[PDB]
Enzyme design. Structure first.
Site, PDB file in Angstrom:
ATOM      1  N   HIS A   1     -10.049  55.393  15.511  1.00 52.49           N
ATOM      2  CA  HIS A   1     -11.141  54.443  15.334  1.00 52.49           C
ATOM      3  C   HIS A   1     -12.145  54.920  14.289  1.00 52.49           C
ATOM      4  O   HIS A   1     -13.019  54.163  13.866  1.00 52.49           O
ATOM      5  CB  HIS A   1     -11.849  54.182  16.667  1.00 52.49           C
ATOM      6  CG  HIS A   1     -12.565  55.375  17.215  1.00 52.49           C
ATOM      7  ND1 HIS A   1     -11.945  56.320  18.004  1.00 52.49           N
ATOM      8  CD2 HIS A   1     -13.853  55.779  17.091  1.00 52.49           C
ATOM      9  CE1 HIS A   1     -12.817  57.254  18.342  1.00 52.49           C
ATOM     10  NE2 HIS A   1     -13.982  56.947  17.798  1.00 52.49           N
TER      11      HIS A   1
ATOM     12  N   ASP B   1      -5.113  57.766  20.334  1.00 49.23           N
ATOM     13  CA  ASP B   1      -6.279  57.547  19.484  1.00 49.23           C
ATOM     14  C   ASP B   1      -6.521  58.728  18.547  1.00 49.23           C
ATOM     15  O   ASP B   1      -7.648  58.967  18.115  1.00 49.23           O
ATOM     16  CB  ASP B   1      -7.522  57.291  20.344  1.00 49.23           C
ATOM     17  CG  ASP B   1      -8.723  56.860  19.523  1.00 49.23           C
ATOM     18  OD1 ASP B   1      -8.526  56.224  18.467  1.00 49.23           O
ATOM     19  OD2 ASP B   1      -9.864  57.156  19.938  1.00 49.23           O
TER      20      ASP B   1
ATOM     21  N   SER C   1     -17.283  62.014  19.066  1.00 50.85           N
ATOM     22  CA  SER C   1     -15.982  61.388  19.255  1.00 50.85           C
ATOM     23  C   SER C   1     -15.020  61.832  18.157  1.00 50.85           C
ATOM     24  O   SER C   1     -15.098  61.360  17.022  1.00 50.85           O
ATOM     25  CB  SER C   1     -16.112  59.864  19.268  1.00 50.85           C
ATOM     26  OG  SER C   1     -16.691  59.389  18.065  1.00 50.85           O
TER      27      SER C   1
END
Lengths: 169, 169, 169
Positions: free
Chosen positions: C42, C72, C132
């Site tokens: 992302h 991810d 993240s």
């Protein structure tokens, strides 16, 4: 049995010096024996009467020495009596990233965490309107900073020391 | 290489005794060998059938011994078989402020923090509906409290011990 | 005076290897000397130009090696020059529940906590869009996982190692 991992040492060494601020019709820290107390500006804005409460039960009426809109800091003054609990200060200690720190604010709550950054000073210790203006100390109890307002912010004790001295003009 | 800082000791010493509560058409703690389990009231309110699940895989049907609306506590009862994992209790240990504590609730999650206050018992360990009714132990694994419902709350093991005994009337 | 409890050791041992990701008209980790960097998907979705920034001041243009929509995760590639700070890896270390862990993301922030579960890997270390894709290391600095997206989630370094190797096809 044995010894439970704890930071109580830093508590019984710093907590006494942290006080509560009120308004008679917020947190604060006792710096020196003279009776000077560092707090936050937003805590004293539009204050009718400033009041200081120690952990031992003593209660005082505080005097506004001066504030600094920049760092949101303020200095108070109470009648220094015989025997004041002062916040442990060590001007030789250098705050490294990763150091364990406790956040002392207000019911007198103690949150644990570490020094995230030293850009100001960031910490993952739970900070809120309660401890806003309280102390920030390492495992030794040495003052590392003054809490301000998912990550918390404080002001380096080195800087706060200077600003305090300048407000006494 | 060397030894990573960890509180796993307290985990393998207390986690086995913490169970999960369910309803067949919440957290709980195994107190003694008799099979008594402390949980929360809001967890059993309107319960069709209470079920207890240990970490070893064993599953039981629990019996409601009694609850106390005041402290939001409840006591359950399962058929005590041979070999039950009980929560480590130390009635001699005095919870000091600053003590490291782990919060054991539910997937079986372990959060870390300290004892904030002992007014009830405040802790900065992440508490939620998951661990609501779970255990709260020090680095030694000694039960310090029972989690309840930006700061968490538990009930002193000293108090919970009494209330449990009284519900067995 | 004495020694303040701190995890700075793990910081000066792992922090250098954690970088920042950008887009020229997110976090990342330097794995090996070859110049491979693990990040999140992302973070690179619809990337015009991927940029990597080290803590020493060096800046690079990164190459997208490949991504894995499942976990991810994504792997980047920069021109491996003389002297790269790599993330300390220990394939022999077994992540136990209760282990102290630091979360390194982004201003370069360091949050502290423990390993909650190892189901993925849960941690109470403050995680957000900042960190993240950052690193997750124990008190030793050994990589325990890669942060992803009131409780945080990371990917076991064991798994991330495999997935990285497979994306280099």
């Amino acid at each position: 049995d044995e010894t439970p991992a704890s930071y109580n040492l830093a508590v019984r060494r710093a907590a006494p010096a942290v006080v509560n601020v009120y308004n008679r019709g917020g947190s604060g820290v006792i710096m020196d024996q003279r009776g000077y107390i560092i707090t936050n500006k937003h805590v004293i804005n539009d204050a009718d009467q400033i009041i200081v409460a120690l952990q031992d039960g003593r209660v005082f009426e505080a005097l506004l020495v001066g504030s600094d809109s920049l760092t949101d800091l303020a200095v108070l003054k109470i009648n220094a009596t015989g025997g004041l609990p002062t916040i442990p200060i060590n001007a030789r200690r250098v705050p490294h990233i990763g150091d364990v720190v406790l956040a002392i604010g207000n019911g007198q709550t103690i949150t644990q965490g570490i020094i995230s950054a030293t850009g100001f000073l960031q910490t993952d210790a739970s900070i809120n309107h309660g401890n806003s203006g309280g102390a920030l100390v390492n495992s030794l109890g040495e003052l590392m900073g003054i809490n301000t307002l998912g990550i918390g912010f404080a002001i380096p004790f080195q800087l706060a020391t200077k600003i305090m001295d300048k407000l006494i003009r």
